[PDB]
Amino acid sequence: AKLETVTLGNIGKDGKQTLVLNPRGVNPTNGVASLSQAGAVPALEKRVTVSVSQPSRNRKNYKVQVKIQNPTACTANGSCDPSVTRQAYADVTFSFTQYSTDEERAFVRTELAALLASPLLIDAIDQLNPA
Amino acid sequence: AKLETVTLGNIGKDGKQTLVLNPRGVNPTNGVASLSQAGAVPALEKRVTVSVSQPSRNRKNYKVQVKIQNPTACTANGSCDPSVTRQAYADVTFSFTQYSTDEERAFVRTELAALLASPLLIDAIDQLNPA
């Protein structure tokens, strides 16, 4: 509904890390929410954006889009400020239709969640080896 | 690793609704590994496909793609066989770098899972409330 701080704990690899996201305001040109972590430098921090197609009279079909990115930076020699070395993206796009009931929409979201913890995707993402 | 019969339990809007996925073989042309459900009709069954980028000596980016799509169909009047009326899609595309370590990929994957279970995105998907 109304976005506020989002706290994630015991996140992965070894459960040693935590992540607190603070709301960063809804973009008014295309309705994209934003969240970010309180980092040292604004140019390098973990960001999340959630976009939901607005309700209208008819619409073709709805869309939910989540898009995260985590930049890793290093202090290069001969420079005084960190520069973003690289970053890993990720995004998920749901494409429900007009007549989709609540139960089946809530089935896809937690089927994806329960599948990202299965051994198959653990091996497919952590070590990057196909099936 | 070698794909097996993935069973997902305790999923869907509440409580328990198991879902046993059986492997459907790799596609040689593009390398997508398919999974499916033991349905009575082959065209009325949920399926998921994973696709990890093939490791090469000079590949300066990797890309994992998981694509769930499940149909729901009612017995159309005037015919003896059911026909697909609508279906729900969901695809996620990770995009790492040639130099990304395991601590980054595991972080991204578990962050996405915890966000899928977050109290914001659950309502943004179930009730389609914009944030």
């Epitope: 706290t7 994630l8 704990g9 015991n10 996140i11 992965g12 070894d14 459960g15 040693k16 935590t18 607190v20 937690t110 969640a113 329960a114 990202l116 913890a117 299965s118 051994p119 653990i122 | 339990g9 305790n10 999923i11 578990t110 899972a113 915890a114 279970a117």
Partner: antibody
């Protein structure tokens, strides 16, 4: 739903017996299993924990080089090693299930089984 | 993150409400447990989020907490509520438990 784990075990210092905890009534491969160590007159410790499926292990720093734990899906059992035992190890070892295999919010131990009361 | 609990003994006879706190060191958010054990048997869960009753325990235990300071209280002490209540945090990995306060 019930977790059972003998009553008593005795080793002598140097040896290393593996504690077992059998869980019945809740479809074992869906909830992670946690191990907690209680001294006879002090507080709890939380040795470590794993979940039955995908076998990810969460360890305490102190017990990383002393205990390893595994699962047996066929018999639905959880095993814990304690690879080396000294004199200051006689305690009570509880196995409790808490959580679920795909969420990182609920991890509260709710269904503790009885102890073992190791003696060295 | 190390949790430091508050008075361990608290004495108190069975005629009054009792209130205790379990401080946190580095602002754990509202996710901690309130285990209870009677000596000789395994512990039991009472409050499983901060203010939520766990399964069926009677609604005479109540918890509440700030960003970094949480409290647990009982309305009628009754004869059974003894045995060094414990608190545990689930923010990081260590899940260090608390000191434990007898009654």
């Amino acid at each position: 739903v019930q977790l059972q784990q003998p009553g008593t075990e005795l080793v002598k210092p140097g040896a290393s017996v593996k504690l077992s905890c059998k869980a019945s009534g809740y479809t074992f491969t869906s909830y992670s299993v946690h191990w907690v160590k209680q001294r006879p007159g002090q507080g709890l410790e939380w040795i470590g924990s794993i979940n039955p499926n995908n076998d990810v292990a969460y360890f305490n720093e102190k017990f990383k080089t002393k205990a390893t734990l595994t699962v047996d899906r066929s018999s639905s059992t959880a095993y814990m090693q304690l690879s080396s035992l000294t004199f200051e190890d006689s305690a009570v070892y509880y196995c409790a299930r808490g959580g679920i295999h795909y969420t990182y919010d609920g991890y509260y131990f709710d269904y503790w089984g009885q102890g073992t009361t190791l003696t060295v | 993150i190390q949790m430091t609990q508050s008075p361990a003994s608290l004495s108190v006879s069975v005629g009054e409400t009792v209130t205790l706190t379990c401080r946190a060191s580095e602002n754990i958010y509202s996710n901690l447990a309130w285990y209870h054990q009677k000596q000789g048997i395994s512990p039991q869960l009472l409050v499983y989020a901060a203010a939520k009753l766990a399964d069926g325990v009677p609604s005479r235990f109540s918890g509440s907490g700030s960003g970094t300071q949480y409290s647990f209280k009982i309305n009628s002490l009754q004869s059974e509520d003894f045995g060094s209540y414990y608190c545990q945090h689930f923010w990081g990995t260590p899940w260090t438990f608390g000191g434990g306060t007898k009654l």
